[PDB]
Amino acid sequence: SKEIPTPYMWSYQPQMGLAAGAAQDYSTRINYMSAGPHMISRVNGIRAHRNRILLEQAAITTTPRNNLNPRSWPAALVYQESPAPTTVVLPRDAQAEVQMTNSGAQLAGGGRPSFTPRQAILTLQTSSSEPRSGGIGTLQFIEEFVPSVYFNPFSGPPGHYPDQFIPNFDAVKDSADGYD
Amino acid sequence: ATPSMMPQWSYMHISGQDASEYLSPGLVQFARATETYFSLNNKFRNPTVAPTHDVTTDRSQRLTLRFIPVDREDTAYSYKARFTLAVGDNRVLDMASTYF
Amino acid sequence: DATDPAVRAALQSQPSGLNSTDDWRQVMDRIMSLTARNPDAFRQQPQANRLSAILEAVVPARANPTHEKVLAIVNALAENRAIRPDEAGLVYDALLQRVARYNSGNVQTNLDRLVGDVREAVAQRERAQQQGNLGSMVALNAFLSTQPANVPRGQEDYTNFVSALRLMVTETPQSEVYQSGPDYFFQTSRQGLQTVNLSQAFKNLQGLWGVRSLLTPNSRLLLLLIAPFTDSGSVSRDTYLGHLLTLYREAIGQAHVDEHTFQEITSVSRALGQEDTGSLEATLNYLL
């Protein structure tokens, strides 16, 4: 329980884009209250081999950060859409059609004109004006927030516990939220 | 597919090897011989596993579409309906699934 | 300066403009028009604004520093966590009432000594946070008094391990040791996981220092945390604890290059065009 704990699995909130709070993986537990030492020892080696994978998965995939579940992810640490620039082939020459029309020709329908060899091409930035920060998506909640294997739980002095497992806890208030 | 879950899924045979693979080779050789009179087949769990990658996308895509007629025409003895059967980018349509 | 209790007291008590008492020289440079930028900005004021600044300059007004001296003390008590931020108005009126009952030339000098004393004590705490050593060295050396200094076998591995044990708490300012009942512990960060049990680990490693399925997983958690602070010559090569400390240094280095490999494979699997569900599972099964 302290040596081979149960991992705290994180609850996502798709609206705020943050983790709600982590509770232990109670729903994937395996029942060896009817097993003996030939099989309790084999299941406890699977509880511990899983916890080695989750520490290995967090060392590969989770971003190194001080506060677990921060409230505003920076724009450099959030996956952002960076598309290719949009290449716009402009259909009509503007000042070559105000000279045909002033000369008396009625243009209708639609190089693309037979009376103009000129062709304008415009290249526009597709991405946003400012990089987005504040909340991670679903796919970055999968990469980060690997379930926390919390060895020797709650052994410290108060205030050095994971309070960000709790779904009521504001980090910048250091208090649990209420109904008002 | 989850690396977390493979130790206890393979132990309980939720995702792993078939009984021709995780059993000892003497017991598979026993169960093939005595199968006609003492079957050991339903005593061992065989995991069937659905693939996660390169089968079904996660993007916005409808299963069934609805196609309004582009040009309909009603005669006294017949009725005509002209459609646009648009199959979008990176899709396949078996025409057995199409009907009016 | 943003964490200075007298700079913060000047941003809460002193005016945001140029009065002729706190800023006498800066307003005499403007009255006498010897300012570099806009010298003639004082001649272009009405007599109500222009003569009222000349009178406050040739004979300035006295003021009370007492509300500014006490507010520098209150804003340092609220910063070194001595009071709550909700008690910042309660203890401010409590201290202003005490320096009003007992006001003297001694006390106003003693408040002037104490607002220089709390500038130091705020900076001394913030240096001690970034160093992060004084609360941990006195409680790890208190742990090592309990553990014996002479193991029977493998003393060369034991005295370099406990010297590398002092290297984690020194070269990580967030890490700490403490006591909770009998045993001592080690958190790798404030309010973080990976808490090893020192009294259970050193009663497990005792009897394994010269051995050359039997380790508690917090001892292996200790051998994972002590691994980047252990050289190849700090412990042996054939010893089972020394064989694992090299094996855990390779596991950290492989997890450090599987981290950079993960950021490469998933970057070129989005642009090439794949399932974003399966790009993130086939990569880990390739890396784990």
UniProtKB/Swiss-Prot annotation, chain A:
Q: Where are the transmembrane segments?
A: none
Gene3D superfamilies in alphabetical order: 6.10.250.1460
Q: Does the keyword Phosphoprotein apply?
A: yes
Q: Name one Pfam family in it.
A: Adeno_PVIII
Q: Which residues carry this modification: Phosphoserine?
A: S127
- PTM: Cleaved by the viral protease during virion maturation. May cause the middle segment to be shed from the capsid.
Any GO MF annotation of the entry: hexon binding
> Residues bearing Phosphothreonine?
T63
UniProt keywords (A-Z) are: Capsid protein, Host nucleus, Late protein, Phosphoprotein, Virion
Q: Which GO terms describe its cellular component?
A: host cell nucleus; viral capsid
Q: Would you say which domain of life the source belongs to? A: Viruses
What is known about its subunit structure? Interacts with the peripentonal hexons as well as the hexons in the facets. Part of a complex composed of the core-capsid bridging protein, the endosome lysis protein VI and the hexon-linking protein VIII; these interactions bridge the virus core to the capsid.
What's the family?
Belongs to the adenoviridae hexon-linking protein family.
Q: What is this protein called?
A: Pre-hexon-linking protein VIII
Species: Human adenovirus C serotype 5 (HAdV-5)
Swiss-Prot record, chain B:
Q: What is this protein called?
A: Hexon protein
The family classification in the record reads: Belongs to the adenoviridae hexon protein family.
Protein's job: Major capsid protein that self-associates to form 240 hexon trimers, each in the shape of a hexagon, building most of the pseudo T=25 capsid. Assembled into trimeric units with the help of the chaperone shutoff protein. Transported by pre-protein VI to the nucleus where it associates with other structural proteins to form an empty capsid. Might be involved, through its interaction with host dyneins, in the intracellular microtubule-dependent transport of incoming viral capsid to the nucleus.
Quaternary state and interactors: Homotrimer. Interacts with the capsid vertex protein; this interaction binds the peripentonal hexons to the neighboring penton base. Interacts with the hexon-linking protein; this interaction tethers the hexons surrounding the penton to those situated in the central plate of the facet. Interacts with the hexon-interlacing protein; this interaction lashes the hexons together. Interacts with host dyneins DYNC1LI1 and DYNC1I2; this interaction might be involved in intracellular microtubule-dependent transport of incoming viral capsid.
Q: What is the lineage of its organism?
A: Viruses, Varidnaviria, Bamfordvirae, Preplasmiviricota, Tectiliviricetes
Q: Which domain of life is it from?
A: Viruses
Q: What else is known?
A: All late proteins expressed from the major late promoter are produced by alternative splicing and alternative polyadenylation of the same gene giving rise to non-overlapping ORFs. A leader sequence is present in the N-terminus of all these mRNAs and is recognized by the viral shutoff protein to provide expression although conventional translation via ribosome scanning from the cap has been shut off in the host cell.
Q: Where in the cell is it found?
A: Virion; Host nucleus
Q: Which organism is it from?
A: Human adenovirus C serotype 5 (HAdV-5)
N-acetylalanine occurs at: A1
From Swiss-Prot, chain C:
Q: List the disulfide bonds.
A: none
Q: What factors induce this protein?
A: Expressed in the late phase of the viral replicative cycle.
| Any one of the GO CC terms | viral capsid, decoration
What does the UniProt record tell us about how this protein is modified after translation?
Cleaved near the C-terminus by the viral protease during virion maturation to form the mature protein.
Query: Region Peripentonal hexon-tethering domain: start and end of each range?
Result: 1-103
List every stretch annotated Binding to hexon-linking protein.
135-238
* Protein's cellular compartments: Virion; Host nucleus
In terms of domain of life, where is this protein from? Viruses
User: What spans are recorded as compositionally biased (Polar residues)?
Assistant: 11-21
Tell me the segments the record calls region Disordered: 1-21
Question: Phosphothreonine: which positions carry it?
Answer: T261
The alphabetical list of record keywords is:
Capsid decoration protein, Capsid protein, Host nucleus, Late protein, Phosphoprotein, Viral genome packaging, Viral release from host cell, Virion
Sequence similarity:
Belongs to the adenoviridae hexon-linking protein IIIa family.
Quaternary structure (record): Interacts with hexon proteins; this interaction tethers the peripentonal hexons to hexons situated in the facet. Interacts with the penton protein (via N-terminus). Interacts with packaging protein 3; this interaction is required to promote correct genome packaging.
Anything else known: All late proteins expressed from the major late promoter are produced by alternative splicing and alternative polyadenylation of the same gene giving rise to non-overlapping ORFs. A leader sequence is present in the N-terminus of all these mRNAs and is recognized by the viral shutoff protein to provide expression although conventional translation via ribosome scanning from the cap has been shut off in the host cell.
Role, per record: Structural component of the virion that acts as a cement protein on the capsid exterior and which mediates the interactions between the hexons, including the peripentonal hexons, and reaches all the way to the penton vertices. Two hexon linking proteins IIIa, one from each facet, stabilize the unique edge interface between a pair of facets. As the virus enters the host cell, hexon linking proteins IIIa are shed concomitant with virion acidification in the endosome.
Query: What is the name of this protein?
Result: Pre-hexon-linking protein IIIa
- Span within the full-length protein is 4 to 301 of 585
